[PDB]
Enzyme design. Structure first.
Site, PDB file in Angstrom:
ATOM      1  N   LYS B  44       0.795  -1.233   0.000  1.00  0.00           N
ATOM      2  CA  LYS B  44       0.000   0.000   0.000  1.00  0.00           C
ATOM      3  C   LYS B  44       0.831   1.289   0.000  1.00  0.00           C
ATOM      4  CE  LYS B  44      -3.438   3.015   0.651  1.00  0.00           C
ATOM      5  NZ  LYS B  44      -4.543   3.244  -0.391  1.00  0.00           N
ATOM      6  N   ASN B  68     -13.784   4.412  -5.443  1.00  0.00           N
ATOM      7  CA  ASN B  68     -13.177   4.508  -4.113  1.00  0.00           C
ATOM      8  C   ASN B  68     -12.766   5.946  -3.775  1.00  0.00           C
ATOM      9  OD1 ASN B  68     -10.078   4.925  -3.660  1.00  0.00           O
ATOM     10  ND2 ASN B  68     -10.166   3.717  -5.604  1.00  0.00           N
ATOM     11  N   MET B  70     -10.594   6.239  -0.652  1.00  0.00           N
ATOM     12  CA  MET B  70     -10.060   5.638   0.592  1.00  0.00           C
ATOM     13  C   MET B  70      -9.413   6.744   1.505  1.00  0.00           C
ATOM     14  SD  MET B  70     -10.871   2.514  -0.042  1.00  0.00           S
ATOM     15  CE  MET B  70     -10.207   1.586   1.344  1.00  0.00           C
ATOM     16  N   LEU B  72      -6.074   7.334   1.533  1.00  0.00           N
ATOM     17  CA  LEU B  72      -4.742   6.860   1.860  1.00  0.00           C
ATOM     18  C   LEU B  72      -4.608   6.316   3.301  1.00  0.00           C
ATOM     19  CD1 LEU B  72      -2.142   6.663   0.154  1.00  0.00           C
ATOM     20  CD2 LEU B  72      -1.930   9.204   0.578  1.00  0.00           C
ATOM     21  N   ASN B 128       4.072   7.214  -6.200  1.00  0.00           N
ATOM     22  CA  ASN B 128       2.746   7.518  -6.653  1.00  0.00           C
ATOM     23  C   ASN B 128       2.578   9.011  -6.932  1.00  0.00           C
ATOM     24  OD1 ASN B 128      -0.019   7.673  -7.070  1.00  0.00           O
ATOM     25  ND2 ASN B 128      -0.595   6.819  -5.190  1.00  0.00           N
ATOM     26  N   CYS B 131      -1.633  11.749  -6.950  1.00  0.00           N
ATOM     27  CA  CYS B 131      -1.767  12.002  -5.545  1.00  0.00           C
ATOM     28  C   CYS B 131      -1.983  13.490  -5.228  1.00  0.00           C
ATOM     29  CB  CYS B 131      -0.482  11.538  -4.867  1.00  0.00           C
ATOM     30  SG  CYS B 131      -0.165  12.282  -3.269  1.00  0.00           S
ATOM     31  N   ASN B 133      -1.556  17.227  -3.970  1.00  0.00           N
ATOM     32  CA  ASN B 133      -0.541  18.184  -3.574  1.00  0.00           C
ATOM     33  C   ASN B 133      -1.164  19.230  -2.646  1.00  0.00           C
ATOM     34  OD1 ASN B 133       1.947  19.455  -3.452  1.00  0.00           O
ATOM     35  ND2 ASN B 133       2.059  19.900  -5.637  1.00  0.00           N
ATOM     36  N   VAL B 194      -2.459   2.618 -15.355  1.00  0.00           N
ATOM     37  CA  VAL B 194      -2.840   3.914 -14.813  1.00  0.00           C
ATOM     38  C   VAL B 194      -3.402   3.719 -13.444  1.00  0.00           C
ATOM     39  CG1 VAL B 194      -3.504   4.898 -17.055  1.00  0.00           C
ATOM     40  CG2 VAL B 194      -5.191   3.598 -15.796  1.00  0.00           C
TER      41      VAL B 194
HETATM   42  C1  LIG Z   1      -9.490   0.345  -2.749  1.00  0.00           C
HETATM   43  C2  LIG Z   1      -8.424   0.852  -3.698  1.00  0.00           C
HETATM   44  C3  LIG Z   1      -7.297   1.414  -3.120  1.00  0.00           C
HETATM   45  C4  LIG Z   1      -6.303   1.948  -3.945  1.00  0.00           C
HETATM   46  N1  LIG Z   1      -5.178   2.514  -3.409  1.00  0.00           N
HETATM   47  C5  LIG Z   1      -4.167   2.884  -4.201  1.00  0.00           C
HETATM   48  C6  LIG Z   1      -2.915   3.360  -3.644  1.00  0.00           C
HETATM   49  O1  LIG Z   1      -2.847   3.318  -2.404  1.00  0.00           O
HETATM   50  N2  LIG Z   1      -1.917   3.750  -4.478  1.00  0.00           N
HETATM   51  C7  LIG Z   1      -2.048   3.692  -5.813  1.00  0.00           C
HETATM   52  O2  LIG Z   1      -1.065   4.045  -6.510  1.00  0.00           O
HETATM   53  N3  LIG Z   1      -3.218   3.316  -6.413  1.00  0.00           N
HETATM   54  C8  LIG Z   1      -4.240   2.830  -5.665  1.00  0.00           C
HETATM   55  N4  LIG Z   1      -5.437   2.378  -6.226  1.00  0.00           N
HETATM   56  C9  LIG Z   1      -5.544   2.320  -7.675  1.00  0.00           C
HETATM   57  C10 LIG Z   1      -5.233   0.903  -8.107  1.00  0.00           C
HETATM   58  O3  LIG Z   1      -3.825   0.745  -7.910  1.00  0.00           O
HETATM   59  C11 LIG Z   1      -5.406   0.907  -9.642  1.00  0.00           C
HETATM   60  O4  LIG Z   1      -4.506   1.828 -10.197  1.00  0.00           O
HETATM   61  C12 LIG Z   1      -6.797   1.321 -10.086  1.00  0.00           C
HETATM   62  O5  LIG Z   1      -7.746   0.661  -9.237  1.00  0.00           O
HETATM   63  C13 LIG Z   1      -7.001   0.791 -11.541  1.00  0.00           C
HETATM   64  O6  LIG Z   1      -6.956  -0.667 -11.707  1.00  0.00           O
HETATM   65  P1  LIG Z   1      -8.171  -1.739 -11.784  1.00  0.00           P
HETATM   66  O7  LIG Z   1      -9.089  -1.190 -12.873  1.00  0.00           O
HETATM   67  O8  LIG Z   1      -7.565  -3.101 -11.840  1.00  0.00           O
HETATM   68  O9  LIG Z   1      -8.994  -1.494 -10.529  1.00  0.00           O
HETATM   69  C14 LIG Z   1      -6.448   1.847  -5.406  1.00  0.00           C
HETATM   70  C15 LIG Z   1      -7.578   1.287  -5.984  1.00  0.00           C
HETATM   71  C16 LIG Z   1      -8.582   0.780  -5.171  1.00  0.00           C
HETATM   72  C17 LIG Z   1      -9.850   0.231  -5.809  1.00  0.00           C
HETATM   73  C1  LIG Z   2      -5.181  12.665   1.514  1.00  0.00           C
HETATM   74  O1  LIG Z   2      -4.946  11.723   0.444  1.00  0.00           O
HETATM   75  C2  LIG Z   2      -6.094  11.538  -0.301  1.00  0.00           C
HETATM   76  O2  LIG Z   2      -7.221  11.892   0.084  1.00  0.00           O
HETATM   77  C3  LIG Z   2      -5.939  10.885  -1.567  1.00  0.00           C
HETATM   78  C4  LIG Z   2      -6.878  11.156  -2.596  1.00  0.00           C
HETATM   79  C5  LIG Z   2      -6.744  10.519  -3.846  1.00  0.00           C
HETATM   80  C6  LIG Z   2      -5.664   9.630  -4.076  1.00  0.00           C
HETATM   81  C7  LIG Z   2      -4.703   9.375  -3.066  1.00  0.00           C
HETATM   82  C8  LIG Z   2      -3.666   8.480  -3.292  1.00  0.00           C
HETATM   83  C9  LIG Z   2      -4.130   7.004  -2.872  1.00  0.00           C
HETATM   84  C10 LIG Z   2      -5.066   6.450  -3.789  1.00  0.00           C
HETATM   85  C11 LIG Z   2      -6.327   6.087  -3.343  1.00  0.00           C
HETATM   86  C12 LIG Z   2      -6.783   6.323  -1.978  1.00  0.00           C
HETATM   87  O3  LIG Z   2      -6.166   5.905  -0.947  1.00  0.00           O
HETATM   88  O4  LIG Z   2      -7.840   6.990  -1.859  1.00  0.00           O
HETATM   89  N1  LIG Z   2      -7.284   5.565  -4.252  1.00  0.00           N
HETATM   90  C13 LIG Z   2      -6.991   5.359  -5.627  1.00  0.00           C
HETATM   91  O5  LIG Z   2      -7.865   4.917  -6.384  1.00  0.00           O
HETATM   92  N2  LIG Z   2      -5.703   5.668  -6.067  1.00  0.00           N
HETATM   93  C14 LIG Z   2      -4.722   6.229  -5.161  1.00  0.00           C
HETATM   94  O6  LIG Z   2      -3.586   6.497  -5.593  1.00  0.00           O
HETATM   95  C15 LIG Z   2      -4.849   9.999  -1.810  1.00  0.00           C
END
Ligand SMILES: Cc1cc2nc3c(=O)[nH]c(=O)nc-3n(C[C@H](O)[C@H](O)[C@H](O)COP(=O)(O)O)c2cc1C
Ligand SMILES: COC(=O)c1cccc(CCc2c(C(=O)O)[nH]c(=O)[nH]c2=O)c1
Ligand SMILES: Cc1cc2nc3c(=O)[nH]c(=O)nc-3n(C[C@H](O)[C@H](O)[C@H](O)COP(=O)(O)O)c2cc1C
Ligand SMILES: COC(=O)c1cccc(CCc2c(C(=O)O)[nH]c(=O)[nH]c2=O)c1
Lengths: 313, 313
Positions: B44, B68, B70, B72, B128, B131, B133, B194
């Site tokens: 993660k 989503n 989430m 982070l 990553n 994200c 800024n 992506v």
């Molecule tokens: C619950 C969830 C959490 C994610 N958290 C991250 C993350 O922490 N860092 C990141 O680079 N991308 C994160 N992503 C994006 C996934 O890495 C991926 O790039 C995105 O879901 C596209 O792929 P998929 O269509 O297989 O879902 C998250 C996606 C999901 C659904």
């Molecule tokens: C304060 O950090 C955030 O609210 C936030 C918002 C959007 C994306 C991120 C980076 C983590 C991430 C998340 C996530 O943890 O929300 N979800 C994704 O689908 N891709 C991601 O790269 C953090």
């Protein structure tokens, strides 16, 4: 019970219409859209001179949606102006004319000519802020200073209420910037969200090939792939543009998808890929299905639920 | 006939791994991904301090994919650094550690600390860029000046080969600029395309409600919605960054989706939504399905077809 509504000073039998570029290029297409049960129609985005567009295959559809790189093929502004001025039957439904000139000057030249027909006949203008790629520069709607220029110039030259067709945005900061630009212009009465999602790429596993010829297979996506993006954009602009209408476009195949657009804040709902694939019969199905959802929920009017999507806590 | 690959000075039994954020938060998750038949795993995306993340519900999945926001949630960098230095079994498969600091300074601090463990154990860094800024500015990778800053300072602080996770782009201008920025940095050896398609909005028709709580329902889209968008981005960077690897991520549910990514140019292939929904058993299915497609086509290794998508003319 019926889905009739009034806006922009016109009456519409229901909120449905074609999306620009679908079933609206030729006199035959426009007459067929007119004869359909749609609430309104929009002509193909035009340029000053006729264009052949890109080499074929340049559109393909699949179970989850479509990809296109048509290249703005169209019969030229003179043809759509003549359609609006002499041929369209306004007693049947309203007409919108989409314009998509390759420079601000070209757009200014077409709107100056459309103005007196808009006054006389009531044809409405949709300004399309998307164009073919120019290396070294972003799309107009992704370049907020160019967007502000086009809008300043067109509002000056046209002088009447008009709307703008927008590409999708994907970042909250861009929603706030784009909506602030649109809100500088009192003559922009409606915003259409969204155009196709730019530069996707469909590959066929059997042939190991892209499926359309222009641009190495890259083209705009519509249909089921883009529904949540289309809803986010309608709702983002509905919230930020309280003095304008939002028209929803993207991913509508059923009365349920139309119902979601309207909840998100859509006043009119455009149908693109699904119209291309199913044909103009789709409009009677979409009416029946939206009426059916409304009856089950007890809604008598679109106004009762437009923009009323609920958030959590 | 085999799925084996050697890249970045490591050997991988097959190209599959989890997408960051899926099944990789906790020690229990990481040991699960290690026990699975995936070729690698990524931790993660972490911040310096542990985070609880956004209020729930903050993820939801549907037939065509997921949404989503989430926020982070993560156990903090010290935990993931400890997992890499002391707990991971590198004899099973390689580990990537994804970092996603909230400011350039937070990233720099993490990567100084990572660097000795990366040299000693072989853990690989994924930065990553998709994200936040500063709020009201676009995310880092949609702001090319902030992006160049993050890459300059991280290159300097880390001094070792790393990769970058990129948001999707939708305009050719952005592909051109983004790749040119990336190509300034010789330590960037891989680009993952992506991350989720930003700020979509899923609405439930029965309840007339958004389905996640943060950000009024707006959240990043994954899964079947985003495959063409993910393939476009993989191919755009594969073509523009001939000295770097591209890892594909977006919409992988089947060996056939994996096969498309690889024809587009993918080296590694990551699995997010479908992994979240089906669980780590998906990796044996994906390997089987991809080997069947290869057998039917006469392909014996991945290099025979990687990047070989055909265009028309
Ligand atoms: C619950 C969830 C959490 C994610 N958290 C991250 C993350 O922490 N860092 C990141 O680079 N991308 C994160 N992503 C994006 C996934 O890495 C991926 O790039 C995105 O879901 C596209 O792929 P998929 O269509 O297989 O879902 C998250 C996606 C999901 C659904
Ligand atoms: C304060 O950090 C955030 O609210 C936030 C918002 C959007 C994306 C991120 C980076 C983590 C991430 C998340 C996530 O943890 O929300 N979800 C994704 O689908 N891709 C991601 O790269 C953090
Ligand atoms: C074949 C084709 C031609 C199109 N031409 C135009 C056009 O000329 N002007 C325009 O504003 N949008 C055009 N579009 C975009 C549609 O108006 C619509 O915004 C897009 O397809 C998303 O809607 P959908 O999901 O219903 O297809 C076209 C779309 C397709 C598929
Ligand atoms: C990013 O926009 C473009 O690449 C582009 C290319 C050619 C034409 C246009 C404008 C007309 C248009 C077309 C088209 O005629 O190709 N297709 C769409 O999905 N939306 C459109 O607005 C945009």
């Amino acid at each position: 019970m019926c889905l009739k509504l009034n806006l922009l000073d016109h009456v519409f039998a229901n909120p449905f219409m074609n999306a620009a570029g679908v079933l609206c290029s030729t006199e035959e297409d426009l007459r067929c859209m007119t004869a359909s049960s749609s609430g309104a129609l929009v002509s193909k985005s035009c340029t000053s001179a006729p264009r052949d567009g890109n080499p074929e295959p340049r559109y393909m559809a699949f179970p989850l949606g479509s990809i296109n790189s048509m290249g703005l093929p169209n019969l030229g502004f003179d043809f759509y102006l003549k359609y609006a001025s002499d041929l369209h039957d306004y007693s049947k439904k309203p007409l919108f004319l989409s314009i998509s000139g390759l420079s601000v000057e070209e757009n200014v030249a077409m709107v100056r000519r459309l103005a007196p027909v808009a006054q006389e006949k009531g044809v409405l203008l949709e300004l399309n802020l998307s164009c073919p790629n120019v290396p070294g520069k972003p799309q107009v709607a992704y370049d907020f200073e160019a967007m502000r220029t086009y809008l300043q110039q067109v509002s000056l030259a046209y002088g009447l209420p008009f709307g703008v067709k927008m590409p999708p945005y994907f970042d909250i900061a861009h929603f706030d910037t784009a909506a602030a630009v649109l809100n500088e212009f009192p003559l922009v009465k409606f915003v259409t969200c969204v155009n196709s999602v730019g530069n996707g790429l469909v590959i066929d596993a059997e042939s190991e090939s892209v499926v359309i010829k222009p641009k190495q297979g890259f083209g705009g996506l519509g249909g089921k792939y883009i529904l949540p993006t289309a809803l986010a954009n309608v709702n983002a602009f509905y919230r930020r543009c309280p003095d304008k209408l939002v028209f929803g476009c993207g991913g509508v195949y059923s009365g349920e998808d139309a119902f979601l657009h309207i909840l998100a804040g859509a006043s009119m709902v455009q149908v693109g890929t699904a119209l291309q694939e199913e044909g103009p019969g789709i409009f009677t199905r979409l009416e029946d299905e939206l009426l059916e959802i409304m009856a089950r929920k007890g809604y008598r009017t679109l106004e009762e639920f437009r923009g009323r999507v609920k958030t959590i806590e």
